Amino acid sequence: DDDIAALVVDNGSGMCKAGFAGDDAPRAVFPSIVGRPRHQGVMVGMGQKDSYVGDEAQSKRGILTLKYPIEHGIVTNWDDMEKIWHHTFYNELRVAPEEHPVLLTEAPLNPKANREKMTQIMFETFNTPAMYVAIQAVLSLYASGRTTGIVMDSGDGVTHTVPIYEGYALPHAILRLDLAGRDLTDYLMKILTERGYSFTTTAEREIVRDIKEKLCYVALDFEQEMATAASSSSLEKSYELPDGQVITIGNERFRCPEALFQPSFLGMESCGIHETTFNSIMKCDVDIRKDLYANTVLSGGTTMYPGIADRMQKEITALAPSTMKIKIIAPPERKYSVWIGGSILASLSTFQQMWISKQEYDESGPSIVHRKCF
């Protein structure tokens, strides 16, 4: 009866979700994009109300430039955040922010100004009564229903692995790798340009992202896949464009996600995601390693590649000792599970102590988020 509870807002790097607490599915799902008129002032200033947001922005791909206000989990532009947040509050949820608490998510090891700026925007612009900031990986572990395991979360801007044993987090073993789906999009464009299909601008960005989501897969064996793709054409598929032209992907279906495991294709001096998980496990203590082997949890929209779980299990079993067992939990709904975690965490009766109310903000300022959260 607390003004139909709080609102869970999972503002991902490439796409935002919002909804009410206590519900299984988010009410609103739309990309986090701001579209502006590109260079012209034609047709009586066509492109009026110059900020196009969300679905309306991707509707007019040809005549606009699409800018992502979140890059690598860090807010480059704050006006675009508060425009997106205004769109979420008023244009789709259609609820007043004055009577509803807000839950927000962020990357683990982020610059400290982001929390203070989000608190300032929540309390000074939308005057929300209470607000809290959490971590996506802890929400994923909440959504999985387990209190012990290692969580990988890979969105469009950041990948991070955290271990949690018995509800106790280990801050020294938390890792952050800056290799996400945007880099895979750029690599897909690079390998598509060699075939003959050159894709440059933001409309091409949306088209290439759609191609990657609809036609990619993680090969179990890379050299065997190369031999199969060179020998025959059974792996080849066809993708039709919105106008009607049809192209063939072929060899580019499995080379795009392989940069997740071998970053040498992307031009980055880094290890793979499996090495990140293994090194995060080795940084824990001796005894609690085994449970972290038996409770590996995947999350995020990047992990919807087909066959990622079996391949990463094969890699981990190649690295791990042969005595104990390795299993990987890959729920089919994991892309939304972070938001679902919020829908659990705002639903708990004991969480009412943890809200940052306006009265304490009016005495402490935006620095109170360092003491109240985490």
Binding site: R38, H39, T65, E71, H72, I74, D178, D186, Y187, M189, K190, T193, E194, S198, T200, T201, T202, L266, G267, M268
Partner: protein, 98 residues
Amino acid sequence: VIRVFIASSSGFVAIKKKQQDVVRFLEANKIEFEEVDITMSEEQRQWMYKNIPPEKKPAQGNPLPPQIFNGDRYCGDYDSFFESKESNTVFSFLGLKS
């Protein structure tokens, strides 16, 4: 010959991302280029501040490392490159005909 100026070691993620985007674009379009590091050699780093025109500089501090030159013709920074990518005028921007 196109010369792109790259800082191999940098404390800012966005600088490395922009440099890798420029490298990927030159790599995909089969365009021959020179790979020059400003951290590894002081002389080229001093020359790179010296070539660029003053009417578009950063107000505080040294200019950002990703810069494009055509021989000793100065093409531009990452901003003009992204604008030409949007406007499909990249080949004119680098000065390479057609």
